[PDB]
Design a protein around this ligand. Structure first.
Ligand SMILES: [Mg+2]
Ligand SMILES: [Mg+2]
Ligand SMILES: [Zn+2]
Ligand SMILES: [Zn+2]
Ligand SMILES: [Zn+2]
Ligand SMILES: [Zn+2]
Lengths: 274, 85, 178, 550, 189, 171, 112, 87, 97
DNA sequence: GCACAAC
RNA sequence: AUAUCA
DNA sequence: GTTGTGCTATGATATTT
């Protein structure tokens, strides 16, 4: 029944999800436009922790002796101190970071950090160190501008939806909202220089790989998405054993019938009052 | 008409194989024709997936006296790979 | 593999709809005058009188001999002969249909030169009759406006009796004396 | 093969459903069908100018198919007609027919509710033909009078006269396969006869039945009532001639003969002195046979049974269930170039390989096409013959002529021509679809790489057990061989095992290390575990990807 | 069939049923590809399905030698059935019902064999002996209950079922010399 | 009459022709299949114009065999007779039943009964002719005919004509 | 809000077994049940009562009663469903069938 | 109507080749090659028509063109020369 | 062996469209009928030898397409016709989309 | 034997 | 049709 | 309120009239 109901749902060449009638079901497959097989659980960082430790991790204050970047972290660090033009970039960067925070907390209200997102950024930073033999004791040749403006320019390249009009472009910005939140939390100026100790060469490679991997992760038009969905649900419903085990709401297979039949007379009706 | 591609040589003129002859796939154990007019072939071949040696062959008539013949085929099945235990 | 046209039609299942064709200018569904270009623009029907048809085909069969020699890189009575040369060079040779058409066109054409044909084309196009009628007027030589309106009943009242006689006068003059 | 036709090959783009106009049924038909006799020109061996091939389809390995010729493996079979004595209901629309009658004025033919009515104006606005009929019916099933006089859309003071006729409408109810009316001290009750209905429907206006969902060209109400009967050709109802005293006819051929017999009977009754009640008695017999032929599982009615006590396989019932024509011959069907056997595990195979018994590989075939690349290699295969493993079974010429290599005397001599095909044995590294039922998700069918091995089992790597859900307790699996160069590309590029490793079902790999290897990979990994030189060299060598550096 | 390439008068051809092909044994040319299983195809007409669940079971076998070609189903009770419509449609078959009635003399042979303890192969020979001699001018006007009493010994004398003429004199009836002359004018036919 | 028509044919190419002389083979296959054919729908397709600008377009590749199907758009001169059309032509045959007049690629038959009163078939003439006092119609003369009707036999179009009315006949 | 609670209730049935299905698959099912305007059941009188192709609807559960109605309503099947092309034995418009491949003479003369 | 051909600029689909597009191109070309279609690449001893088609595809010398149908009837033509292969 | 519904769902979920087609046609049923292009019926009297066609009833000898469909599909349409239903097959579209 | 659909 | 197989 | 109407796991294999 599940298959025969999702049969003709697929993704079309405008990254939309329609049936044999052209009726729109989803506007961008999976709401993100990503092919499920290319997704991995990743820690969203930003979302949790104390405000105090968040500040310790992301804030850079080139205008303050203590909270600036130590000249051990980069070459330009000694002549970076007090640079008013630059500090507006980092102020922007950190303002955008705290925006993401209050947003992620509006999206995952329980504060869960680990969600499935494409492109494993943690393993790209790893592969960048293993590759360029990053020296965790020598200053990098990155400029604040190199890092900050680089990550802003990458973001504009992670396109799922092309389309010159405004509506499509908006649906584009929206489908990359959560990924870019992850992205800014991992290539934040401080974190790049202090925790990853990347070099200009490594950093540029990392941004290159991110873009190329992101592209590889978007759904291919033609993907039968619906049959795929029915099987993805039908199959583990077979492995379902209740078959309780060692031993008051109806769960498992018989409850799954109710849901699909939209049975008006359900066995275990209840409501959780807070 | 419509003879079986299998071989009929193992048949004695009574249309039966004598017991003791070794058989094999598609070979003709019992020769039969259904005259209609000269006559079509209604013979019984050994199952194509099997083989062995004919164990015993008996000729009889039934409750109303129709000649009918039973043929036993013996094989020895030696444990092989896909076999279940 | 049945060669198709330039226009579309709704298959109402009732094949019983086709009408006949006459000299009430009811040509086919195919040959009605508002028809469509390969580029998709709506142009008018093209019916040729002979002379005009004889030139189109001749001009086209020569454009074709050219192209065949390119790819090779890597008096009326006299014309009847030259034409049969051009055919054995450019056509499939089995084309008895075209071979007769050229013998016919070559023997029945009133105007020989492209200039003369153009003169007929100019003259007959101020009258704004059907393209079928101007073709007939270019093919059938007539002396009286009655002869015309008898052999081309499609006219009757489209053009005046005396204005049509003016035209037959100018056609008779343009007529090539082989 | 199947011979060439100059007709343009096209694909089906639209399917236009409708009902058969009796005019059309008559027009298509290539035979009259007059007699309930099968063949037997009285104890003979030829078809009777009456039922199956009166002029019709052809069977029995004989061309004769009315000029058309061709015979069996080309002839689609063409239809005959049967002219019914009186109209009868098509069982499928007894429903609809009753509903239409409730919507239309009987004896008049007008719709019971106008655009003048306010709720009907709304129903008539509906876009879906099906939903519109629903609304319209629910409105004027209760309208029990054909109005002549109706208040205008200005004010109820002056009435505007709509369509005439001012009769009472019967409350129509279904009694068996008959429709019974009732007009309102004690009402008038009688049976609406088919001829009435058929006539009332014809009078229904084109704009009216169009509003009722019908369509002026393809599906008119009057065609819900059967007047002419399309007779299906033998292909749809095959016969078999066993041994001159045994002959098998299809249940439809039986059911048809009853329709005919019942028809011939009622025709004689009407022609003769019509005894009214002895005719309607014979009509509702005809009604039954025709009805029971399209559907034998009818609620309320007795089933038509076939001597042995079994009920006649109606047409409905052939399409219906799983194992029907839809679920079981179209949406799924058995296929050639397939194989099945017991699986067993093999730790010495690659993940993407599959162990194929030599016996199976010698039976299954791939029709490789001769080009000057494989021309030498194929000539050797043909020359091997179908007995030795690396060889071939058939050679197919350009004409479509196929030659059984096991019967040609100059087998190795056949000078292959480019464009000819050679059906060769499945060889090592040919791509195959491997499948274990029930195929619950897409990893239950994966493209593998043939390794021809001995013994009678399919051999697969253990880590591939997890998605097929196979244990080796006597499980069997299915192999399918692609036949096109194009179709194997679809397997190798899309369905291939190594591709299916990371699954979209749950964004994680669905295949892992299992059983022995999982258990032993722990015992190898302990800090206690040390290995000495002699056995280390053996482990190293055992890795095929070893860089040769101790 | 005969191979178009070879053409030798005894056309040596094999039916490779297993590959579903008809081959010429000499040149190897395949002469046909569509090939059908007659056993399983015959299983669709004469099966073991009396219940009605088999989707393969779709026809029924008949006997064109004995009852000619009379295809006819019977109105009977089904799962969802009112006992009213069965009666009406059966009372309607009564109005639709001479030599098409002399087939009830098969019911005379069948009820005689079952009273004489005779096999199913004997009845079908007695019914074929009776169908091919009951309208003969060579029998003309013989005792009509002694010509079917003679066609039972004709059916027994081929099916190898030992039945003396005095054994059939006990059944019906038989007038000895009357069904003895009739047992000879038919024997010539 | 004698029209120029915008037509399109579907040719299918087997992959082995997917070489450099592809467009050439196609235009050739067009001139083979279309030129000198005859259909009820368009008449006699006599000659294809502008051999250089024949549009080959792109070829959809069929999904079973590798072959590729094109929709070749071309312009042609056609000939389709109509009832009521008046045509000049030549007599090609002449029997006791009438005579045929070859007009363009098509013949038109003039039955002896759509002929002037006194114009009657005389068989003593060599060759047999129609011999009025002021007319002689035989196997080579030029005639003006009025087409009384056409018969479509999808391979050729044949027609029947009259010379009875005013302004017709010999010329 | 019903769409959400419907995903939530389905999610619970999968997570109660300790299993995990990627959000999109469940969201797709749920999104399908609700784009009609209300809760469309995955049953013979739900999803199979929509206005899709007639052969498609007939391949699940109601077969003949769907084809009779298809006849009297003079339905037209546009053959975009996978079911139709399978019944018809044509290359389905799915995956490898979601586009078309054509030869270009211009560039073929370029490469050779 | 054939006005539903979206022009070269104004194309808006992925400039990357889809996994099925590539599968069909390889299959299609391999097929034609095995049907003796001319080969547009120096086969360096290669004999398997799929292996050859892959060599054609990695040299961008397949003269095919994907016609991408949109759900409303329109289409965008892309040539394998221009599509990006990153699979 | 039976390539069933569930085995079909898998070949779809994979996107292997041609494989599905080959498995359902070449690997099995695979029949060719001629249809009239006026009524979408299969009532054409195709005498392939004489290259004559014609669908009388439409009196059409010019508008005929040949198509490739499963025999079981041809069986299905003939059975629907048997029941008065007209499964009309057309080779051109008329609907947009 | 359900469970939901129409009388 | 029963029995059975995973 | 009652009736009435669709369906109810995938494939496989072996006999019995
Ligand atoms: Mg198991
Ligand atoms: Mg297991
Ligand atoms: Zn035929
Ligand atoms: Zn009325
Ligand atoms: Zn031979
Ligand atoms: Zn037709």
């Amino acid at each position: 029944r599940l298959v025969k109901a999702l049969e003709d749902i697929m993704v079309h060449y405008d990254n939309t999800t329609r049936n044999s009638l052209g009726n729109v079901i989803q506007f961008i497959y999976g709401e993100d436009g990503m092919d499920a097989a290319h997704i991995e659980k990743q820690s969203l960082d930003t979302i949790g922790g104390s405000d105090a430790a968040f500040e310790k991790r992301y804030r850079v204050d080139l205008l303050n002796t203590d909270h600036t970047l130590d000249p051990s972290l980069l070459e330009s660090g000694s002549e970076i101190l007090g640079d008013l033009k630059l500090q507006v970039l980092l102020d922007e960067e950190y303002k955008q970071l705290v925006k993401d925070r209050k947003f992620l907390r509006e999206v995952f209200v329980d504060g869960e950090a680990n969600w499935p997102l494409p492109v494993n950024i943690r393993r790209i930073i790893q592969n960048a160190q293993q590759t360029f033999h990053i020296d965790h004791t020598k200053p990098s040749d990155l400029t604040i501008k190199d890092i900050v403006l680089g990550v802003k320019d990458l973001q504009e390249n992670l396109l799922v939806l092309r389309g010159k009009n405004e509506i499509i472009q908006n649906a584009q910005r929206d489908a990359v909202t959560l990924f870019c939140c992850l992205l800014r939390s991992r290539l934040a100026t401080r974190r790049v220089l202090q925790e990853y100790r990347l070099t200009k060469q490594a950093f540029d490679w990392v941004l290159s790989n991110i873009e190329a991997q992101f592209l590889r992760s978007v759904v291919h038009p033609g993907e039968m998405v619906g049959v795929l969905a029915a099987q993805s649900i039908g199959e583990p419903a077979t492995q379902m054993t209740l078959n309780t085990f060692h031993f008051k709401v109806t769960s498992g297979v018989p409850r799954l019938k109710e849901i699909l039949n939209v049975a008006k007379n359900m066995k275990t009706p209840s409501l959780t009052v807070y | 008409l419509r003879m079986k591609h299998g071989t009929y040589d193992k048949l004695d003129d009574d249309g039966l194989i004598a017991p003791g002859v070794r058989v094999s796939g598609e070979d003709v154990i019992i020769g039969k024709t259904t005259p209609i007019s000269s006559k079509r072939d209604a013979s019984t071949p050994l199952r194509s997936t099997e083989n062995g040696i004919v164990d015993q062959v008996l000729v009889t008539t039934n409750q109303d006296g129709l000649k009918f013949v039973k043929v036993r085929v013996r094989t020895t099945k030696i444990p092989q790979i896909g076999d279940k235990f | 593999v049945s060669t198709s046209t330039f226009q579309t039609r709704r298959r109402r299942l009732k094949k019983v709809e086709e009408e006949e064709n006459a000299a009430t200018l009811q040509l086919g569904q195919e040959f009605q005058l508002k028809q469509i270009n390969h580029q998709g623009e709506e142009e008018e029907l093209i019916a040729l009188n002979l002379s005009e048809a004889r030139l189109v085909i001749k001009e086209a069969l020569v454009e074709r001999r050219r192209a065949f020699k390119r790819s090779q890189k890597k008096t009326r009575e006299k014309e009847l002969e030259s034409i049969d040369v051009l055919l054995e060079q450019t056509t499939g040779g089995n084309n008895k249909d075209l071979k007769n058409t050229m013998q016919y066109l070559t023997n029945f054409s009133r105007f020989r030169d492209q200039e003369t044909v153009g003169a007929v084309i100019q003259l007959l196009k101020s009258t704004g009759l059907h393209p079928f009628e101007v073709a007939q007027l270019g093919s059938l030589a007539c002396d009286t406006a009655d002869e015309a309106k008898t052999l081309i009943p499609s006219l009757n009242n489209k053009i005046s009796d005396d204005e049509l006689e003016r035209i037959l006068k100018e056609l008779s003059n343009l007529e090539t004396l082989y | 093969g199947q011979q060439y036709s100059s007709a343009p090959l096209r694909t089906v783009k639209e399917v236009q459903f409708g009902l058969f106009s009796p005019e059309e049924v008559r027009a298509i038909s290539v035979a009259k069908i007059r007699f309930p006799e099968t063949m037997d020109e009285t104890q003979t061996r030829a078809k009777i100018g009456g039922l199956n091939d009166p002029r019709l389809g052809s069977i029995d390995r004989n061309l004769k198919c009315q000029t058309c010729q061709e015979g069996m493996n080309e002839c689609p079979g063409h239809f005959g007609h049967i002219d019914l004595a009186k109209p009868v209901f098509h069982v499928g629309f007894i429903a609809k027919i009753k509903k239409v009658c409730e919507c239309v004025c009987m004896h008049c033919g007008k719709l019971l509710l106008d655009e003048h009515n306010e709720l009907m104006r709304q129903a008539l606005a509906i876009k879906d033909s099906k939903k519109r009929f629903a609304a319209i019916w629910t409105l004027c099933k209760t309208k029990m009078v054909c109005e002549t006089d109706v208040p205008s859309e200005d004010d109820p003071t002056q009435l505007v006269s709509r369509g005439g006729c001012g009769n009472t409408q019967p409350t129509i109810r279904k009694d068996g396969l008959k429709l019974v009316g009732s007009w309102k001290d004690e009402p008038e009750l009688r049976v609406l006869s088919t001829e009435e209905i058929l006539n009332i429907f014809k009078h229904i206006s084109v704009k009216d039945f169009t509003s009722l969902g019908f369509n002026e060209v393809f599906s008119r109400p009057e065609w819900m009532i059967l007047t002419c009967l399309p007779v299906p050709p033998p292909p749809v109802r095959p016969s078999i001639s066993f041994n001159e005293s045994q002959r098998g006819e299809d249940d439809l051929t039986f059911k048809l003969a009853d329709i005919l017999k019942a028809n011939i009977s009622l025709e004689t009754l009407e022609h003769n002195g019509a005894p009214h009640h002895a005719i309607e008695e014979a009509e509702s017999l005809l009604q039954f046979h025709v009805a029971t032929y399209m559907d034998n599982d009818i609620a309320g009615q007795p089933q038509a049974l076939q001597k042995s006590g079994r009920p006649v396989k109606s047409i409905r019932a052939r399409l219906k269930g799983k194992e029907g024509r839809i679920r079981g011959n179209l949406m799924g069907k058995r296929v050639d170039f397939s194989a099945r056997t017991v699986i067993s595990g093999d730790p010495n195979l690659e993940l993407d390989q599959v162990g194929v018994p030599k016996s199976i590989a010698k039976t299954l075939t791939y029709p490789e096409v001769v080009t000057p690349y494989n021309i030498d290699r194929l000539t050797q295969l043909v020359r091997n013959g179908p007995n030795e493993h690396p060889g071939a079974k058939y050679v197919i010429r350009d004409s479509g002529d196929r030659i059984d290599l096991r019967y040609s005397k100059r087998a190795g001599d056949i000078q292959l021509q480019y464009g000819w095909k050679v059906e060769r044995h499945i060889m090592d590294n040919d791509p195959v679809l491997f499948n274990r039922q029930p195929s619950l998700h897409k990893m239950s069918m994966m493209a593998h790489r043939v390794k021809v091995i001995p013994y009678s089992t399919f051999r697969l790597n253990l880590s591939v057990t997890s998605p097929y859900n196979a244990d080796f307790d006597g499980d069997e699996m299915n192999l399918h061989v692609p036949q096109s160069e194009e179709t194997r590309a679809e397997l190798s590029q899309l369905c291939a095992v190594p591709l299916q490793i990371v699954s979209p079902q749950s964004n994680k790999p669905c295949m892992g290390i299992v059983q022995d290897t999982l258990c032993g990979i722990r015992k190898l990994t302990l800090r206690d575990t040390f290995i000495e030189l002699d056995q280390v060299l053996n482990m190293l060598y055992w890795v095929p990807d070893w860089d040769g550096v101790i | 069939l005969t191979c178009p390439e070879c053409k030798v008068y005894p056309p040596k051809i094999v039916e490779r049923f297993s590959e579903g092909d008809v081959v010429c044994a000499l040149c190897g040319l395949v002469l046909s590809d569509k090939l059908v299983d007659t056993r399983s195809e015959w299983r669709t007409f004469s099966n073991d399905d009396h219940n009605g669940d088999d989707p393969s079971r779709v026809g029924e076998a008949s006997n064109p030698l004995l009852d000619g070609n009379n295809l006819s189903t019977r109105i009977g009770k089904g799962e969802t059935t009112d006992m009213r419509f069965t009666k009406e449609l059966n009372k309607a078959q009564g109005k639709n019902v001479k030599d098409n009635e002399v087939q009830a003399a098969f019911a005379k042979i069948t009820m005689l064999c079952d009273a004489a303890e005779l096999p199913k192969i004997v009845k079908d020979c007695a019914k074929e002996a009776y169908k091919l001699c009951h309208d003969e001018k060579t029998l003309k006007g013989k005792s009509m209950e002694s010509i079917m009493a003679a066609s039972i010994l004709i059916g027994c004398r081929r099916a190898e079922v030992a039945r003396t003429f005095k054994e059939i004199q006990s059944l019906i009836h038989v007038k000895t010399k009357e069904f003895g002359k009739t047992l000879n004018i038919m024997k010539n036919i | 009459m004698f029209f120029i028509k915008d037509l399109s044919l579907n040719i299918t190419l087997h992959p082995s022709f997917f070489g450099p002389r592809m467009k050439q083979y196609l235009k050739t296959k067009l001139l083979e299949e279309v030129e000198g054919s005859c259909t009820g729908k368009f008449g006699y397709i006599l000659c294809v114009l502008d051999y250089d600008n024949i549009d080959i377009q792109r070829g959809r590749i069929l999904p079973t065999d590798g072959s590729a199907e094109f929709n070749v758009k071309y312009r042609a001169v056609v000939f389709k007779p109509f009832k009521g059309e008046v045509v000049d032509g030549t007599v090609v045959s002449c029997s006791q039943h009438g005579f045929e007049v070859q007009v363009g690629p098509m013949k038109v038959f003039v039955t002896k009964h759509l002929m002037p009163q006194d114009l009657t078939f005389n068989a003593g003439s060599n060759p047999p002719s129609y011999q009025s006092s002021e007319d002689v119609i035989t196997i080579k003369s030029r005639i003006r005919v009025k087409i009384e009707g056409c018969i479509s036999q999808v391979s050729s179009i044949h027609a029947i004509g009259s010379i009875k009315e005013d302004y017709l006949g010999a010329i | 809000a019903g769409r959400a609670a419907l995903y939530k209730e389905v999610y619970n049935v999968i997570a109660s077994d300790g299993s995990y299905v990627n959000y999109r698959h469940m969201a797709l099912l749920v999104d399908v049940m609700t784009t009609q305007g209300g809760l469309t059941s995955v049953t013979r009188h739900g999803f199979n009562r929509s206005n899709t192709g007639a052969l498609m609807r007939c391949s699940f559960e109601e077969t003949v009663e769907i084809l009779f109605e298809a006849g009297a309503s003079a339905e037209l099947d546009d053959c975009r469903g996978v079911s139709e092309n399978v019944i018809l034995g044509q290359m389905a418009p799915i995956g490898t069938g979601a586009f078309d491949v054509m030869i270009d003479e211009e560039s073929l003369v370029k490469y050779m | 109507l054939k006005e539903k051909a979206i022009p070269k600029d104004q194309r808006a689909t992925t400039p990357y080749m889809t996994k099925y597009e590539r599968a069909r191109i390889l299959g299609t070309r391999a097929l034609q090659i095995s049907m003796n279609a001319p080969v547009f690449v120096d086969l360096e001893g290669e004999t398997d028509p799929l292996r050859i088609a892959m060599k054609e595809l990695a040299e961008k010398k397949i003269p095919l063109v994907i016609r991408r149908y949109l759900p409303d009837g329109s289409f965008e033509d892309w040539s394998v020369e221009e599509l990006i292969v990153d699979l | 062996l039976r390539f069933g519904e569930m085995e079909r769902d898998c070949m779809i979920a994979h996107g292997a469209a041609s494989f599905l087609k080959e498995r359902l046609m070449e690997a099995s049923d695979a029949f060719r009928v001629h249809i009239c292009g006026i009524c979408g019926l299969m009532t054409v009297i195709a005498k392939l030898n004489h290259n004559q066609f014609e669908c009388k009833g439409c009196d059409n000898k010019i508008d005929i397409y040949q198509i490739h469909i499963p025999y079981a599909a041809k069986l299905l349409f003939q059975e629907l016709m048997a029941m008065n239903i007209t499964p009309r097959l057309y080779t051109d579209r008329s609907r947009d989309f």
